[PDB]
Amino acid sequence: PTTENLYFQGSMNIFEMLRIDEGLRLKIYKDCEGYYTIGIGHLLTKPDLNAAKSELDKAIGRNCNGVITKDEAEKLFNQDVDAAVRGILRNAKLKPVYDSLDAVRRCAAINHVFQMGVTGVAGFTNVLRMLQQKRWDEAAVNLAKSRWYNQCPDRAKRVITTFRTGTWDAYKNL
Numbered sequence: 001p002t003t004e005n006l007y008f009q010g011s012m013n014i015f016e017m018l019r020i021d022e023g024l025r026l027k028i029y030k031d032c033e034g035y036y037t038i039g040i041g042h043l044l045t046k047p048d049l050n051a052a053k054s055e056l057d058k059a060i061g062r063n064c065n066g067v068i069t070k071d072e073a074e075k076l077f078n079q080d081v082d083a084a085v086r087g088i089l090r091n092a093k094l095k096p097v098y099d100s101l102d103a104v105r106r107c108a109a110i111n112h113v114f115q116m117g118v119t120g121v122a123g124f125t126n127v128l129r130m131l132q133q134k135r136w137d138e139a140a141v142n143l144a145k146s147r148w149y150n151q152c153p154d155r156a157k158r159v160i161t162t163f164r165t166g167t168w169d170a171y172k173n174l
């Protein structure tokens with residue numbers, strides 16, 4: 001690794017990770033599952049655009065008519081990351097597994113929750129046991145069986161690789 005390459009891990013964190021997986025959109029769009037989304041992966045609601053816009057105005061605090069700024073995207077993103085972290089730490093099932101993980105895999109954990117929500121993740125009984133037991137190849141094969149990955153592979157693939165390796169390699173060379 002070059003001097004530069006060794007710096008790359010210090011430039012990666014959960015925010016940068018999710019920013020790559022989710023992208024950044026300033027107008028309402030439908031995600032890969034068809035759900036109204038804005039900003040950096042902010043799911044507004046699970047078909048009526050009108051509902052999605054009302055949730056938007058509620059989330060941002062002004063009349064947005066479907067559009068936000070980059071600064072507003074960031075603030076909402078930071079709130080969503082905080083919610084995912086808090087969701088793990090309060091959960092009797094996820095906290096122990098999360099605690100056992102290294103820093104990089106903890107980012108993958110927070111990412112997984114950000115994308116699927118707490119109960120979805122906490123339902124992956126086998127994967128969670130594999131993670132705690134450091135069976136990284138098995139955890140990754142099992143994650144690759146999930147609907148979460150399979151219905152929308154490009155959003156999940158780097159997270160799965162990150163669970164396998166505990167490195168940031170999947171986020172290099174975009």
